[PDB]
Amino acid sequence: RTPPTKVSILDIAGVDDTLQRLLKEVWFPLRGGEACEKMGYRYDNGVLLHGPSGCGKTTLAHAIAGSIGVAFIPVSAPSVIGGTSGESEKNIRDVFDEAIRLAPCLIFLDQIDAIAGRRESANKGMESRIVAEIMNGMDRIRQNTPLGKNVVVLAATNRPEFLDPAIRRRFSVEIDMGMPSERAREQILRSLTRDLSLADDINFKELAKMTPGYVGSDLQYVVKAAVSESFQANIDSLLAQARAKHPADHLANVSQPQRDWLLLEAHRDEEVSWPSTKITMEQFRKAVSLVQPASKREGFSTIPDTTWSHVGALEDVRKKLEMSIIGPIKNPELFTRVGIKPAAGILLWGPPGCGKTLVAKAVANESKANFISIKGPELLNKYVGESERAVRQLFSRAKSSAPCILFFDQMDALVPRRDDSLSDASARVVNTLLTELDGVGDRSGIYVIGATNRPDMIDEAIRRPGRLGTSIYVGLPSAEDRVKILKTLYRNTVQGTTDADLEKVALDLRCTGFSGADLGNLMQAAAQACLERVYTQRQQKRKEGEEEIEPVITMEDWEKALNEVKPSVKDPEKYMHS
Template identity: 40%
Template sequence: MERRIVTQLMTCMDESHRPVKPDDNAKGTTLPTDKKNTEAESDDEPGYVLVIGATDRPDAIDPALRRPGRFDREYALGIPDENARMQILSVLTHNLRVEGAFDLMKIATSTPGFVGADLTSLTNKAGNLVMKRIMDARKVELSRESVDGEDAEEWWRKPLSPEEKEKLSINMADFEEAAKLVQPSSRREGFSVIPNVKWEDVGGLDPLRHEFERYIIRRIKNPKDYMGFGVDLETGFLLYGPPGCGKTLIAKAVANEAGANFIHIKGPEVLNKYVDQSELNIWTIFNRARTCSPCIVFFDEMDSLTTERGKEGNEPVERIVTQLLTELDGGEERKGVYVIGATNRPNVMDKALLRPGRLGRLLYVPLPTPDQRVLILKALARKKPIDSSVDLVSIGRDNTCKRFSGADLSSLMNEAAMLALEDTLATIDTGWCDTSSTIKELHFKRALKKISPSVSNEQIKYYKDFRNDFRAA
């Protein structure tokens, strides 16, 4: 049936280019006198049929229709950029009652990946929030008046009073709240929730923070300034260093500070046993990121995907590396797409990835210094009942904590909390309950005897040698 329809459509579209003669028009039809005169005056002018098609699956259309003479021109209506979103919002808010300072550009900036239908839903949601605010105020007022009976059950059915109609206007806060509630259609698959991790949670690592603020965060927040100076900075970063030093935490903090879309890829989940499926997964990730730019793509444990090519039995991973090289520095532009990789084994990665234009910025994440250990302990202590007598500065600078990574310090804090909890439960069992139980200095000293550093001196030397070799190269 579909083939017959396509054949008929092609025939009709080919015939639509023939000039329409007056005799053909007159068959079976009687034209008014004025129309007859018009046809007589324009015998040589052909008639035209304009055909417009719309689809969201152009590759599914028969190729015979996608040639000159049939569908001559194709226009791709992609995801609107920031300026286009602002124009769409100006149309949608044209007839709305708004109050206060209303910044459409700020709304457009905070809605990456939104299409026209999503922005319409955003506007409707903002209106719903206004109605909810009015209904909540009405409900509170009725509860104060203690209305009983039928009026108490039907309070929401009553029409709006003139005072309530005066309050029926949308402000900037309503749109900002609605933007958090509306999920755009292009982000409903593959995107991760923006992590709730801030720089204060990382503790230390100020040089890395400065690098990412310079290359990603400011660039996303102030794109016009960078474009004005023609600055073309690196968009690929590789974080390497001993395990447990906070590489994943840094990437999450960058995504949170930038406010960009975030795709978190665990290396092994891209691999697929079917031929070409792994490459398709890589292409899909970058295609989604381009669609909803600005976007940060974070590859965790990247060494599992990018081992060096040319080794026997490594053919499936080689195809993934080739696809990654194409996406990172190929024909497809990736403006607004920032790639961050994290690995503990940079030596096994293919060297073609570690050049400028791809993962050009190699950032070493070292073990924390004594001062950084103090900052990490203070960041971890914010959510725990630490006794006021505990001196975290002395604990962080103690030689016992030498070679402790961020993960080791987190384990130390959790072990101290567990020891404090056990002491509290023991007092409850004896019949005496202390509701003001806290983590004391004694618990940290006991925990230090149980926790040992997870990074050896040989590992530290290996990372330092790699860093020096890379700089020398």
């Protein structure tokens, strides 16, 4: 005999719509058994729960059992497997036999991909036999049902693709336990906080709002993180106290962590009373900063220290970018009220080294959003079915977590291989990419940025609206802009700043025919010439006559460097026309 367990039903929240559906399907057959028997109509047999790990699949099942008050038969993935080749099958039979005999009951199959995976992926004669046993059992239930047998088979899996298509057909009802909403997260936070003494400054609503792609397990951890952060005060107190009881002078210290450890080791049997303190909103923010879960293994590239102050000029472009990306992320209220859908993607095109890569990062930084950079051919594999699968995976990861900027550097590699016939592998990848782009427009958060030094050979299909429609040109031909760039570069030095010198340098003819990369090089060249002057002068004086070093840079150094240096890019006609 196996009676039900006592689990809290008030623990799970944020699953309003899904729980309602589950109720409808499970309540009628289990609770009103006499009614269903009289009518003669047939009901729901199998309920499959899917979604990521730690989503509360096992808990939901346990809760449902306890709440209804029916008999719970837990079937875990390795619980039925025996030693001899026959005991496993015998046990499966006994499980189903006892289950049909005693009613009402709930059979729960936790982690089903370990028992019934694809029969083509299993070359063993035992695994295929087990799948067959399950099928046979399912049929037996269906036949017995009109008498008074009431058993519902619940099941939980982490991946639907690994399951055998045959068992998928057998199971009729499916519930997706995915990613929660703002309201849902708020509820989860309250459930966890329930046993804690929160301060008045804590607003769970604010936490929930500023918590984008976090799951039930993640929120659980954020609460735990806060607990550890608060108890740092007690650690400091103990350290001071220990250094007074056992001084040990300066013999116990070589470093800081080691000395702390040693003091505690000496104490051992010393019991201390811990005061119950309340948590602040500041402690939660600190805890949040140190958390990185769920989509941590994705390959999340951290945002650099690049701001708008690092980019000289391009003020028009800055404003346009703010509208498109920062507009929807920071002000969702504004967009919903006016009536327009949020963006999908932009394309940065123009001459090399003009700040395209920088702009992408800068925008990501500003928005305080996530950033992923895939450059040129970082997709392709040696196998026949991995490149396409990988692309699919990227979009799946992006869909799961948002806000994020997906950056594709040098699209000049993948896109031109369409207009002229070359390969089959390249064809499959680009077609999958087009497919993935089309399959996303509603439920944004993921903004795709593309960059290319060559706008020439690219397929018009990719350019079409809904895919990468906003074509932003990054070029450089004006005087005012150059002065701003010079100031921006010479801003990051640390007396003598000299503004007048910067303007004059910009005015010169040689400077007119330059680019961002060229100006950077000029600055470096000037610095090198200055070093030569400092070295020659200092060595002569020290040897003949130790003095001080002068890092100052005058105009003579700039003038000499300017005379020598020549431009990189020659013809702008190629970029503009094509």
